[PDB]
Amino acid sequence: TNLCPFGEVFNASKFASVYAWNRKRISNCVADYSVLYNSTSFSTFKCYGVSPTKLNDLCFTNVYADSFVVKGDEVRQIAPGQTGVIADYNYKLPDDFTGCVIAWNSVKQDALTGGNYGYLYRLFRKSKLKPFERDISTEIYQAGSTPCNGQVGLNCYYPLERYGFHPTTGVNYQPFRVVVLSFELLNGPATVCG
Amino acid sequence: STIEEQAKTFLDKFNHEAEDLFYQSSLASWNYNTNITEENVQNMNNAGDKWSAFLKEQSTLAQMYPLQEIQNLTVKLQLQALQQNGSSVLSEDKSKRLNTILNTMSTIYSTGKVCNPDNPQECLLLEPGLNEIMANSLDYNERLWAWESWRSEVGKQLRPLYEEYVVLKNEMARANHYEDYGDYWRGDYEVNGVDGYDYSRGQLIEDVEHTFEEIKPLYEHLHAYVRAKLMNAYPSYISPIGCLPAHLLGDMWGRFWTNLYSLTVPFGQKPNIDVTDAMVDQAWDAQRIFKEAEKFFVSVGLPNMTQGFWENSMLTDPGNVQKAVCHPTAWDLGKGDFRILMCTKVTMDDFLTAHHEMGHIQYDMAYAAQPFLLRNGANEGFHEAVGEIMSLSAATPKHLKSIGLLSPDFQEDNETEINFLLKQALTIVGTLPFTYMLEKWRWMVFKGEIPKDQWMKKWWEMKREIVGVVEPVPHDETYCDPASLFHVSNDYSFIRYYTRTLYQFQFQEALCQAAKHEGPLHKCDISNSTEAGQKLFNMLRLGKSEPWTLALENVVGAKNMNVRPLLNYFEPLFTWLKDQNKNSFVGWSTDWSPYAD
Ligand SMILES: *[C@@H]1O[C@H](CO)[C@@H](O)[C@H](O)[C@H]1NC(C)=O
Ligand SMILES: *[C@@H]1O[C@H](CO)[C@@H](O)[C@H](O)[C@H]1NC(C)=O
Ligand SMILES: *[C@@H]1O[C@H](CO)[C@@H](O)[C@H](O)[C@H]1NC(C)=O
Ligand SMILES: *[C@@H]1O[C@H](CO)[C@@H](O)[C@H](O)[C@H]1NC(C)=O
Ligand SMILES: *[C@@H]1O[C@H](CO)[C@@H](O)[C@H](O)[C@H]1NC(C)=O
Ligand SMILES: [Zn+2]
Numbered sequence: 130t131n132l133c134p135f136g137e138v139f140n141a142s143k144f145a146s147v148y149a150w151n152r153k154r155i156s157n158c159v160a161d162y163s164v165l166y167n168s169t170s171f172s173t174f175k176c177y178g179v180s181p182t183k184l185n186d187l188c189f190t191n192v193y194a195d196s197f198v199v200k201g202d203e204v205r206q207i208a209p210g211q212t213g214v215i216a217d218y219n220y221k222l223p224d225d226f227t228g229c230v231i232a233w234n235s236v237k238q239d240a241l242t243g244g245n246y247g248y249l250y251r252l253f254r255k256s257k258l259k260p261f262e263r264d265i266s267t268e269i270y271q272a273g274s275t276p277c278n279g280q281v282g283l284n285c286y287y288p289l290e291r292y293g294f295h296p297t298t299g300v301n302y303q304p305f306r307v308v309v310l311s312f313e314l315l316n317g318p319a320t321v322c323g
Numbered sequence: 324s325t326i327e328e329q330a331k332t333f334l335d336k337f338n339h340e341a342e343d344l345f346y347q348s349s350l351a352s353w354n355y356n357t358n359i360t361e362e363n364v365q366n367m368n369n370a371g372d373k374w375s376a377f378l379k380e381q382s383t384l385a386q387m388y389p390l391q392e393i394q395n396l397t398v399k400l401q402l403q404a405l406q407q408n409g410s411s412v413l414s415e416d417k418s419k420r421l422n423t424i425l426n427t428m429s430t431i432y433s434t435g436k437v438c439n440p441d442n443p444q445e446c447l448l449l450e451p452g453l454n455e456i457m458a459n460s461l462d463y464n465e466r467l468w469a470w471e472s473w474r475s476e477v478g479k480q481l482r483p484l485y486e487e488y489v490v491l492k493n494e495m496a497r498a499n500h501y502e503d504y505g506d507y508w509r510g511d512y513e514v515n516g517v518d519g520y521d522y523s524r525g526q527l528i529e530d531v532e533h534t535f536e537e538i539k540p541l542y543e544h545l546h547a548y549v550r551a552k553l554m555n556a557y558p559s560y561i562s563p564i565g566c567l568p569a570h571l572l573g574d575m576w577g578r579f580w581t582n583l584y585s586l587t588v589p590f591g592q593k594p595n596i597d598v599t600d601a602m603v604d605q606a607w608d609a610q611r612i613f614k615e616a617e618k619f620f621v622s623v624g625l626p627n628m629t630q631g632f633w634e635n636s637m638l639t640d641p642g643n644v645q646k647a648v649c650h651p652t653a654w655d656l657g658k659g660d661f662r663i664l665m666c667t668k669v670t671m672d673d674f675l676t677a678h679h680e681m682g683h684i685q686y687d688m689a690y691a692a693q694p695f696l697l698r699n700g701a702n703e704g705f706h707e708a709v710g711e712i713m714s715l716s717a718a719t720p721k722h723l724k725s726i727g728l729l730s731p732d733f734q735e736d737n738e739t740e741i742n743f744l745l746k747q748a749l750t751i752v753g754t755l756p757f758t759y760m761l762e763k764w765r766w767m768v769f770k771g772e773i774p775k776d777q778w779m780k781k782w783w784e785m786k787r788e789i790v791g792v793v794e795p796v797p798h799d800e801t802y803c804d805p806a807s808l809f810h811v812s813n814d815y816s817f818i819r820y821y822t823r824t825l826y827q828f829q830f831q832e833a834l835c836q837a838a839k840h841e842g843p844l845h846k847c848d849i850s851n852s853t854e855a856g857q858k859l860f861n862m863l864r865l866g867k868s869e870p871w872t873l874a875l876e877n878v879v880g881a882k883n884m885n886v887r888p889l890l891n892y893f894e895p896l897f898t899w900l901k902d903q904n905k906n907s908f909v910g911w912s913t914d915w916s917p918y919a920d
Binding site: 201244252253270272273274283284286290293295297298299300301302 | 324328329332333335339340346347350387629631635656658659660661691
């Protein structure tokens with residue numbers, strides 16, 4: 130009977146990039162989702178299949194918590210059946226999504242005067258990603274047909290650009306710290322529920 | 324594996340890089356504009372060099388994709404806007420020569436040192452001097468001296484520079500597969516590859532000439548009225564049936580006739596409308612002015628301003644300790660950061676100017692969803708039209724009575740309507756022939772139909788034939804009187820003002836027809852008309868992703884430029900001028916001159 134480490138997940142100092150989103154396996158603890166519901170400090174809290182306030186008296190085998198940072202108008206890509214540079218090349222969710230997404234504005238922390246160019250995201254890829262797969266490669270993308278030998282040149286460019294986060298940019302370009310939960314069911318016993 | 328996929332990926336990379344680079348550049352420029360120091364200018368110039376170098380390198384990388392093998396219209400538009408490098412096509416020595424020529428012309432125009440022959444130590448600069456002299460003074464000899472002295476001091480020096488400039492620009496344009504530099508400018512209104520919405524570059528000249536031929540009668544009546552009133556104001560220096568002297572037109576060149584309002588007022592005893600005192604009484608400040616502008620814009624259904632606008636914009640003069648430029652501007656810094664830089668006093672003119680700038684900002688916010696290379700107006704003459712229609716809709720007495728700045732018992736009559744319409748014609752109809760004649764002369768000199776030993780001759784006879792304005796002093800072939808204007812000497816296109824003047828009235832007429840306005844068009848208010856707001860946003864949200872003809876059809880229903888809305892706007896003043904000038908000769912003879920007695 131322990132409180133799940135949501136403090137070092139939400140209240141954490143720095144969130145990972147969207148192309149290298151942090152994947153933490155939480156289990157063997159007691160998590161009250163009602164305080165997360167009533168935090169009222171998030172701008173997006175949406176999931177289907179089970180209501181969050183009704184999910185409190187339910188549990189499954191294991192739960193996964195995905196966390197990253199994206200722009201403001203890129204949180205809409207975190208949903209099943211969506212298309213975008215985040216939903217395809219950076220973070221894909223299956224149509225049978227069982228958890229939901231927690232996103233909030235984070236200009237006070239992730240935006241600095243002069244530009245916070247430390248957040249990255251993958252722009253190009255030879256094929257779209259499958260649901261729940263990570264790609265942190267650093268190879269050069271070949272847009273043309275000739276090999277460029279791992280060097281950037283004509284039709285060759287590093288497929289990893291940086292988010293330019295400024296404190297003054299509009300909401301459609303402000304950093305939004307996104308947390309994504311996942312509730313999977315297996316043949317094992319249920320260990321994490323209130 | 325194809326070429327279009329590579330072009331799309333390259334455009335994606337370029338957009339995502341250039342957005343951050345341009346954001347940094349505009350941010351440094353803003354830090355300079357609101358805080359004038361030396362390190363701020365250093366940072367602004369450094370960011371500008373970075374942005375220009377990036378643009379040149381990206382044009383170099385983009386010139387590797389042929390347009391003839393690209394099917395997508397948006398990708399083709401972006402590739403065409405990115406491939407036009409500019410002066411890098413010419414040689415290096417010729418490029419540096421042209422740059423030095425432009426810089427020299429700009430410097431001679433900006434630092435013109437003209438002084439009277441009575442005392443050489445003290446004399447007046449252009450801005451705080453010659454402008455106020457030509458705008459407020461009334462002595463004939465004084466205005467003539469100012470005009471002739473500025474001409475002989477600026478154009479006489481700019482003539483050979485302008486000749487070499489013309490030659491180098493023609494060389495650069497012919498190197499870019501254009502016919503001349505005028506064709507390069509007309510390439511702004513060019514549309515290709517869109518069945519049913521095409522527009523050639525000579526079709527622009529054709530439609531401009533047709534629209535001006537249709538405007539001719541109203542301008543002739545206005546010119547007759549102004550000539551009569553100026554003959555009343557100048558008893559022995561204006562012929563009753565001739566042209567108007569060039570220095571009696573309200574400014575250095577005669578671009579606008581706004582400064583002849585006091586001399587040409589219809590009913591001088593009737594008080595013109597002004598809501599400054601009602602603002603002073605009700606404790607009106609900049610914040611209240613901009614809040615009322617935002618409310619006017621949200622009443623038509625357009626979204627209100629963002630929080631960053633109210634948090635970052637400079638709406639008041641920041642005291643005395645820190646100096647900043649006080650020119651009103653609408654700032655689109657990129658990445659969803661819209662701001663307005665304006666030193667606003669408690670004035671009705673500043674109220675209308677704030678409405679104009681917020682219209683600019685609304686138009687900027689509209690097409691923010693378009694790709695980076697397509698975030699601009701449909702053509703060069705759309706932003707100022709979108710601003711001017713908002714200014715017109717907010718300047719009407721109906722809106723001033725709605726927001727409580729005017730008494731509900733105000734008895735508006737035909738006299739005030741005629742006064743307002745005549746002022747509007749002085750500031751609107753008076754600049755159309757000037758603009759058309761100037762752009763026609765510049766196109767014909769760029770083309771070669773005017774040899775360099777006929778420049779001033781053709782310029783002055785075209786002015787006499789079109790604008791109906793005669794010079795008071797004969798000018799030989801050493802003058803470069805066109806270059807005496809800011810736009811001619813600083814390499815700026817001038818037809819955007821004509822096109823904007825026509826487009827703003829087309830927009831006003833369409834928006835009012837969509838608002839179910841009954842009565843004259845000059846008394847129209849688009850406030851609380853969400854249908855009109857939607858009809859306007861349908862075009863505002865496009866940007867330049869579609870041909871400007873389609874964008875114009877999306878509002879006015881017509882694909883082409885037209886002057887019928889402008890004439891329908893000025894019908895009341897037209898009938899008034901027709902009733903007034905029945906006992907006076909209308910028209911001008913291009914032979915009479917104030918120097919041949
Ligand atoms: C982390 O900080 C935020 C902001 O102060 C606070 O609302 C939140 O409760 C903190 N985390 C925890 C687990 O209390
Ligand atoms: C303006 O810039 C100077 C240095 O360039 C700085 O000391 C000052 O604080 C700035 N003022 C504002 C209002 O930012
Ligand atoms: C052009 O490409 C965009 C994607 O960049 C696509 O949405 C659009 O439909 C394409 N249009 C044409 C005519 O190919
Ligand atoms: C602008 O509109 C939004 C939309 O509801 C509203 O929340 C906001 O308060 C408005 N801004 C102002 C200054 O009223
Ligand atoms: C617009 O509608 C509002 C709300 O009814 C009203 O207060 C205002 O006076 C109206 N203004 C005009 C110009 O119709
Ligand atoms: Zn403007």
